[PDB]
Amino acid sequence: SLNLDSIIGRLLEVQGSRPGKNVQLTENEIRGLCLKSREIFLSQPILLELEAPLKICGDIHGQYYDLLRLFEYGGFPPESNYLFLGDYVDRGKQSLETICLLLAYKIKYPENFFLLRGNHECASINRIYGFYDECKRRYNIKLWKTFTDCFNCLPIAAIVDEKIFCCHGGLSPDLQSMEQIRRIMRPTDVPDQGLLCDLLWSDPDKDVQGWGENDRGVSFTFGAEVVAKFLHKHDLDLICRAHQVVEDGYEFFAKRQLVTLFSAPNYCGEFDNAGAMMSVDETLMCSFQILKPAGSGQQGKSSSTGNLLDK
Amino acid sequence: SRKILIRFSDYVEVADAQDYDRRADKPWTRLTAADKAAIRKELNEFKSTEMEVHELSRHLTRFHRP
Ligand SMILES: [Mn+2]
Ligand SMILES: [Mn+2]
């Protein structure tokens, strides 16, 4: 037995408690969430074809009490339909509660609740950026390996109403046809280069003509003309992506041809950003709902990289 | 010119975010050279021997130089 309704109730009940209160799930409850969600992910396409109405959310990074506030604002499932763009775990206090609630909702509402893969939903990244350590502290490394199997089956992109292309990171010089995404077979890791890497890692840059180097040391940057040509070729209206902290929680690029969403306010207690979600109605009107907080020594970057283990 | 369907609302909603201490541990800043070498070895062994990967995707598995 999955014990699904009990799990959800226990995850939600801490909303009236002090921030940071953990939820006491059993190892076998969490394993069941991983295994059943994994089955559902594999049963649905790797390139999701979704319809509005939908609420689209960016990075969460273990900020569980902000996730609860986001659901309170948007409507707890199944009151609204959701698409999340990845980066559920790492670099926050409560990755486990965060991912467990998201997986539980995927199982409970499989046609109304969707999760894409971010670059933190892979073993090499979440081994070091916090999730492995959180798993080890509360459970064991085997549970982290079970999460990895689940993450290796997440879908990679979505298209909403044939007009909004969604992914965590961005475009790729290797993305010529949507069929190239559809042909990717799961379970899979995220490579250090290539199409799947770029979908989870690339960033827009207004000062790049074409494709450029990325300050992260992985993947690419891309300019506004790349966005415009991609939308024209594929008859799309918007790229919706996440992966960068932005002050209002949402930020446009390329004369509103791309938007970045970031859903973790006051990211890791070090940045003063808001977190946002984008609501898409059945008329394809997109609107924003924001949760806003009240030399070489300069503050560090908020971005992650893929090369921290290099010798 | 191409017909665009999407529209954006100019009227944004805002709500006050929770006031709490969001700071989290940074274990990735506490890795010696030897620790990094051990993690590269651990990841490589895990991905090679334990982690299930579809045949058609084994070329995507990300190994680390030991
Ligand atoms: Mn992120
Ligand atoms: Mn990211």
Residue numbers in the entry:
A (entry chain A): 6 to 299, 320 to 336
B (entry chain C): 515 to 580
What does the paper behind this entry write?
The four Phosphatase and actin regulator (Phactr) proteins are novel PIPs that are implicated in cytoskeletal regulation in animal models and cell culture settings.
In IRSp53 complex 2, K452IRSp53 (−3 relative to the phosphorylation site) makes a salt bridge with PP1 D220 carboxyl, in the acidic groove, while water-bridged hydrogen bonds link the mainchain carbonyl and the sidechain hydroxyl of S453IRSp53/S1029spectrin(−2) to PP1 Y272 and the phosphate, and to V250, respectively. The structures of our Phactr1/PP1-IRSp53/spectrin complexes are consistent with their representing the resulting enzyme-product complexes, stablised through the tethering of the substrate sequences to the holoenzyme. In both structures, the residues +3 to +6 form a β-turn, allowing the hydrophobic doublet L459-L460IRSp53/L1035-L1036spectrin (+4/+5) to make intimate contact with the Phactr1/PP1 hydrophobic pocket, entirely burying the +5 leucine sidechain.
